[PDB]
């Protein structure tokens, strides 16, 4: 009768699907609540400067 | 010295961080604020702070 391409016939899936995605790379920046200079400046008087 | 009014001159809280994308989620009767820019997560109660 004739030849047929593979795509010509509908296919049912005999595979079970399992989807895994990787963990994304992340970057941690330097973050502080108070720096050294701010903590030093918190004092009302500094003996050295005075 | 030059005199200025008290209320608009002093601040008891100082702006620390500006977050462009701080995702807010509601979970376990609390709010989770997560920022990937600074890699930081805060937990708050569901009620506003006046």
From Swiss-Prot, chain B:
Q: Where in the cell is it found?
A: Virion membrane; Host cell membrane; Host endosome membrane; Host Golgi apparatus membrane
Give the positions annotated as glycosylation sites: 45
Q: How is it modified after translation?
A: The cytoplasmic tail is phosphorylated by the viral kinase US3. Phosphorylation may be linked to a down-regulation of gB expression on cell surface.
Q: Which domain of life is it from?
A: Viruses
Similarity remark: Belongs to the herpesviridae glycoprotein B family.
Subunit structure as annotated in this protein's UniProt entry: Homotrimer; disulfide-linked. Interacts with host receptor MYH9/NMMHC-IIA. Interacts with host receptor MYH10/NMMHC-IIB. Interacts with the host coreceptor PILRA. Binds to heparan sulfate proteoglycans. Interacts with gH/gL heterodimer. Interacts with gD.
Q: What does this protein do?
A: Envelope glycoprotein that forms spikes at the surface of virion envelope and binds to the host cell entry receptors MYH9/NMMHC-IIA and MYH10/NMMHC-IIB, promoting the virus entry into host cells. Essential for the initial attachment to heparan sulfate moieties of the host cell surface proteoglycans. Involved in fusion of viral and cellular membranes leading to virus entry into the host cell: following initial binding to its host cell entry receptors, membrane fusion is mediated by the fusion machinery composed at least of gB and the heterodimer gH/gL.
Q: What is this protein called?
A: Envelope glycoprotein B
Q: Which gene encodes it?
A: gB
The shown range, given as first to last of full length, is 353 to 402 of 903
């Amino acid at each position: 009768s004739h030849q047929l391409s593979r795509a010509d016939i509908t296919t049912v899936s005999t595979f079970i699907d399992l989807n895994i995605t990787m963990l994304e790379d992340h970057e941690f920046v330097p973050l502080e609540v108070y720096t050294r200079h701010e903590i030093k400046d918190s004092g009302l008087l500094d003996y050295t400067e005075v | 010295w030059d005199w200025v009014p008290k209320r608009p001159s002093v601040c008891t809280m100082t702006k620390w961080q500006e977050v462009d994308e701080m995702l807010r989620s509601e979970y376990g009767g609390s709010f989770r604020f997560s920022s990937d820019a600074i890699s930081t997560t805060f937990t708050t109660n569901l009620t506003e702070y006046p």
